[PDB]
From a paper:
Following transfer of IncF-like plasmids, recipients become refractory to a second wave of conjugation with the same plasmid via entry (TraS) and surface ([name]) exclusion mechanisms. SFX, which is mediated by the OMP [name], is specific for Gram-negative bacteria. [name] is a highly expressed ~24 kDa lipoprotein with a copy number of approximately 29,000–84,000 copies/cell. In this work, we determined the cryo-EM structure of [name] encoded by pKpQIL (TraTpKpQIL) and the F (TraTF) plasmid derivative, pOX38, at 2.47 Å and 2.66 Å resolution respectively. This revealed that lipidated [name] oligomerises into a decameric champagne cork-like structure, composing of a transmembrane α-helical barrel domain and an extracellular ring domain.
To study the structural basis of SFX specificity, the structure of TraTF was also determined. The cryo-EM structure has an overall resolution of 2.66 Å (Fourier shell correlation (FSC) = 0.143 criterion; Fig. 5a, Supplementary Fig. 4 and Supplementary Table 1). Like TraTpKpQIL, TraTF consists of ten identical protomers that form a transmembrane α-helical barrel domain and an extracellular ring-like domain. The TraTF monomer comprises the same secondary structure elements as shown for TraTpKpQIL and exhibits a similar conformation. TraTpKpQIL and TraTF can be superimposed with an rmsd of 0.523 Å over 225 Cα atoms. The conjugation frequency of pKpQIL into ICC8001-pBAD-traTF and ICC8001-pBAD-empty recipients did not display significant differences, suggesting that TraTF cannot exclude pKpQIL. Although our data together with previous work indicate that MPS and the pilus are not part of the SFX process, the subtle amino acid differences between the [name] sequences provide the high degree of specificity.
Residue numbers in the entry:
A (entry chain J), B (entry chain A), C (entry chain B), D (entry chain C), E (entry chain D), F (entry chain I), ...: 1 to 225
The structure:
């Protein structure tokens, strides 16, 4: 019954996309944008860059290839992707005990009909319980979580000093500290986007296109209009 | 019965809009306002800018298009949007167990009437229990939460130094620290608005207009009169 | 019975108004006051400014329109407003289970009178239980909470330096820090007022006038006499 | 029975007045005092100033009207006032369940006398239970809490530098910091007084005079003799 | 029975007086003492100054009236006074349930004697239970707590700089900081005395003289001999 | 039954690969890459370097052997590898008690058939219980966790100062602190990759190729295109 | 049965070797290595040095005897070794109660066969219970944990200053702080290796060779190739 | 039975010796060692110095008597020694209740044989229970814990400054701080060794020789070879 | 039975002596020692000084009387002594309830023998229960804890500056801070020794000699040989 409740409840693909914080951009008349999209997750999003480009072009911006002559940069990295079962949150009643119980109780459906108390009743009841447990275990409330990192670069007129500071860990004992200083006319801001795709027995190939659509729309809407 | 209680209780769309903190503006005789509204959430709020403009014009302010000649700026970003089920807070009695129980108990309504103990009683009881569980599971106490970031800019006479400081994270190890300094005659303040729309089996298309109305009224009332 | 207890207990509108901290003003012979009242909440408090003006005039102070020639400023912002059900604090026994139980037990009132055990007894009992649950669910112990921010300005003779410091958050990564310095002959102090209006099935239109009265009286009494 | 216990226990008005900390004043031969009493609470304490003046005059001090020629200042503000029910601390056994139970058990008083098991017994028992629940709910153990802030000013011969420092919060983001410096021959000290008035079904009009008496006596006794 | 146990246990007035910390005074041949006793509590301790003077004179010290020519100062302030019921610590078994139970069980004393099962037995039992509950509720284990602040001043030969520092809170936002510096030949030390008076149904008029005696003896014994 | 549920649920090899944080690389026209892969874990991943080289070459980059003339460095170390049983999370119902119980209950399958209550029934039941416990204990839900450290070096034009700081612990008492400074034109960033391979009775030889494939794809995708 | 489950589960020697953190070594053409292996644990690991030397030679490195002419140093210390019983984690069901229970229940195997209720049944049952408890207690799930400290030294060209700082504790009261400074051309890094050997009734002589093999392979693989 | 389980489990002397941290010594050609072993514990370890000397000589080092001409110093102090009962960890079932229960149940062994229900059965049962409780209480799972502090001194060429800092506590109030500075050519490092000897009814005289052997071997192995 | 278990378990005097931390003394050829032993505890340890002197003389050291010509100082203070009952750790089953229960159950020993059910059986049972409770209460598992502070002074050649710093508390308010500086050629170190003497119904006069022996041996062994 729990599997039936899960199947009835989350019978439709539900997709959520949430930005972490807001990046404020001053109004400007420049239109050039340069995109750089990477994917270091096990899942596949090959069309994300194209969808981002289409959404950006829909706002009047012009997408260029050489980063030198672009006023805006959209750097995105699909960093992490995980798949989990929400039914596992309860721990119990998920392995298949309830389905097994229902299947076993189904044996009363054979004690009251046709041959009964003939030994075959126990076998039929055991088979029904096993089938019920298998069916209950094969129903999964799958949720895909995806973490994307976005870095927006905006060209300015004030000199910007970038101070690279890295502390490369070195075997418990210590670390190597690297520091450097550069000067350039470009501001960079970061943000994080979290995506969720929930369904019953969901396969990522079905959730991929709408996930890409929502992520591209959000990242493009960072730019505004 | 729990589903019936939820349906009776939250039978009307309830909308709440709460501002985080107060932004104090000194009295002034200037009227020009420039609006910039963005939406990086999965939900659609397309009429928010128009409603904000109408509410601002209702207060005697004049909305202009070029930010250079505007005394006030209203920068808003509909940052986040989430949908949740309040019935999930209890965890149990929400999957549909209670409705299933009521449906099963309905079988006594067929044991006392017409044919009984004929085997068909068990089938009718099981069907009624399944239908009751399905009906109980299909009743949702949905709540939509919306997070909006507002940034108000007011022109002043004192020189304002903006110190851009960003710490762009770089792979566990370190970060790139960007710093810059600009000078301009403009103060900027921030605030956050949280909106909630609650109803039973609510669809966001119904809650959208009143949500926009309340959000626009609050953001415009920041300006006063 | 719980709904009956709630209805009996909070049968009268109860309104509480509490200031957070005390603002100490030195004795002075000046009388001019300038009011500025804003409302960024979903609730409507339109008469608050007029009531504040009347209460201030009742103390001998004179209300002026131009802030330049006013010795005192009363800046108020009705910031937040929320509505909650106190019965929800128990969680259970609030959905309507107790009323349903009473309604079901009412079926014994039909088993002992007129026709009984005729099948219609179960139907009448179920209808009575449903009606009891509906009646229990429709009784709400509503409490409206209002948060108001007050800022009192008093003109002095010592030069006051205002150091505007703002840290506008910028996308997880960083922030823009704005700093400015002004000099003027005016001190400003803040405070917070919390208002509560409690009743059974209360509508805010009934609680609005007394809420405004108490809030205006408190804010005016800040000035003393 | 619980309501009866509460009524028997707290049948008399109990008033407590507790000062927070001690303000030490050096012995002096000066007698002039200037009073300034304000009330920013919803409760009415109009006679507090007169009672303070009478208590101060009873100690040999002389009350003056112009603060310039007063050696001592007594600045008081009745800041907060709240009303609560102590029976609510238990949560349960307070709504009226126990009174309802007693009223229902009273039905045995009609089963053993006159007509019985006639249907009217159930109605009489239900009416008695309802009346008992209403009576139990209508008994309240009310406690009024009052918070008063006292500021005593004493004239000295050493130059006292007052450094006004205020951090006016500005919309989550930041704050405006106001600083100023003045020089004068006056020390100021603060303290807090907490008053409690407890009774059953107490109305504040009855507890007002003794509350004022105790508060005035404490504030005057700060001065000593 | 619990009330009987409390009455038997704390049948005698028990008074405890505890000093917080020790004030060390160097041996000296000076005898002059100046007393200054104040009372800012709701309780009345009028004879405390006289008892302190008597105890000090019993040690060979001489009490003077003008503070200028006194080597020692004894400044005392009876700051706080509270009254509580120790039986309330258990919460339950204190309202009167146990006495009510005993009174109800007393009805068996009328079922076995004279007329019985005549209806009057229930009435007599109910009256006995009510009387028992009333008697149990009217027995109170009262404890009076008194907090006194003591400040001892001793004249010395080294110059003592007193730095008055006060932070007068100003409405959530900020504070006014007052600082001053004086020079004088006098050291001052503080301490706290806590007094407790415990009895059953105790009235403060009975506990006042012994409380004053113990407090005066302790404060005088600070001086030694 | 629990073992059957585990076998049905995790019947397919599930491999997850998650990067810790994002390493941002500026766009560049350089293609040369130098690989250095080490493995300090007990598991064997010998083909990881070849797969990384193939994936990098698929992106248009050119792999060189001498690190001096390489623009990019990919340094990877398969640091840790652990194997655990997820069924051990429950602690109980995993040792084999449930399988033993089922096997023992199987004895009723021999009491109802053929010879019964002949002593041999107990022996057959005990053997069946032992076999069931053994079968339940031999089903393992194995999960392999692999921790890999990645260090990417990118050649730049700004001088980079590396400050080696190490605190070699010396016997509880103290430490030897080594510090040195070098200058070079190369930035280095770190990151961590976590891999999981889950199955029932999984042998690492089966999970090795897919684990290597996913890890190589992620590390190569760090470079982008 | 628990002992049987443990024996079935961990019937094979399971050995795990995990490095704590990664030591990064720059690519170099030098091959000379100097080994120094010590063992301050109670267990015997005598072949570890030879296995490390063989593994290092298998990578093309050349092992030398004089540390002066060695480019690399491999300093290792087998610091700690502990042996524990995993069955002790449950605390109960481990002493032998379950085996005793099974042995006692075996007495029913003698009540149903041959002589019974003859007194000898109790003796046989007691002997069987004692033997079962002894057998259950004699089955141990032994786990050997080994902690090894590794220190790798690499010759460089930059001057390295070693600051020896030691705080030798001196009897609760204090410490003796020793500080010294040396200069040399050698970097040193540390790391920790944790080894586990798990089996039923395992003797360390069986787990020693594979433990040495894995530890040597890991330490050598630090060097790479 | 619990005593029997303990006796069966820990029937053999188990000795563990664990060093806290590793002391790293640079390779050197010097051989001279000077030993200084002290024992401030209640237990007797007289042969520890001789065993340390033998183990050191077995490594090729030469033991000298005058510390002036020794390159290495081995300073050891057997600081603490404690004896505990592991069975006390359970608290209950250790005093002897279980043995008493078994002894009492043994009375059924006399009710079924020879004379019975003759009064002597109760006496025999009581005596058996007392004997069983005594036997259960006399079985102890004893564990001896020893804490040893080791201080190794190594002669160097760099000047080492020792800063003696001690804070001798002085009666709650304060402390006497002693500081001094010396210069010498010697480094000193510390470490701690923890030894455990576990057995049933173990006497320290049996565990002493192997404890000394393991401790000496570990301390000598600090030096290496 | 619990008292019997305690008496059987701790039937022999068990004495433990544990030093807190190690005091390291450099090797030296000086022999002179000066002892100073004080006892500020309620217990009597009069022979401790003599035993310390004997133990020190047994090591070849020479004890002198004038501290000026002594190379070593042994300053010891037997600071604290406490006596506790370990049986009180359980709280319950210690007052004597179990012994009372056994004594009461002994009444069955008189119901089955001689006269019975004659009223005298109850009296004999009550007397036996009272005697059993008294006997159980009179068995105490006494543990004496002794805390000793040791201060060892060693003469050196480096100048040692002692900075006396004391913060004498002055009545809650403040403190008097005393500071002084002296110079001398002597180092001082501290340590703490904890002694425990455990037995059933132990009297300190029996545990005194062995306590002194162990404490003296430990303090003397601080010096070594």
């Amino acid at each position: 019954c729990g599997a039936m409740s899960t199947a009835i409840k989350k019978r439709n693909l539900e997709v959520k996309t949430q930005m972490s914080e807001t990046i404020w951009l001053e109004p400007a008349s420049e239109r050039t944008v340069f995109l750089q999209i990477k994917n270091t997750s096990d899942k596949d999003m090959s069309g994300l860059q194209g969808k981002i480009a289409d959404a950006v072009k829909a706002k009047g911006y012009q997408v260029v290839t050489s980063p030198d002559k672009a006023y805006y940069w959209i750097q995105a990295n699909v960093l992490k992707a995980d798949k989990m079962d929400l039914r596992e949150s309860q721990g119990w009643l998920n392995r298949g005990y309830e389905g097994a119980a229902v299947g076993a109780a189904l044996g009363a459906g054979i004690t009251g009909y046709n041959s009964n108390s003939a030994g075959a009743t126990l076998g039929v009841g055991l088979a029904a319980g096993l089938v019920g447990m298998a069916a209950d275990a094969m129903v999964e409330d799958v949720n895909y979580t995806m973490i994307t990192d976005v870095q927006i670069a905006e060209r300015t007129k004030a000199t910007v000093t970038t101070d690279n500071v890295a502390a490369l860990r070195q075997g418990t004992s210590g670390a190597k500290i690297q520091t450097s200083t550069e000067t350039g006319n470009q501001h960079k801001y970061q943000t994080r986007v979290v995506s969720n795709a929930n369904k019953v027995n969901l396969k990522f190939e079905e959730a991929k296109p709408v996930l890409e659509d929502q992520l591209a729309k959000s990242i493009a809407n960072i730019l505004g209009s």
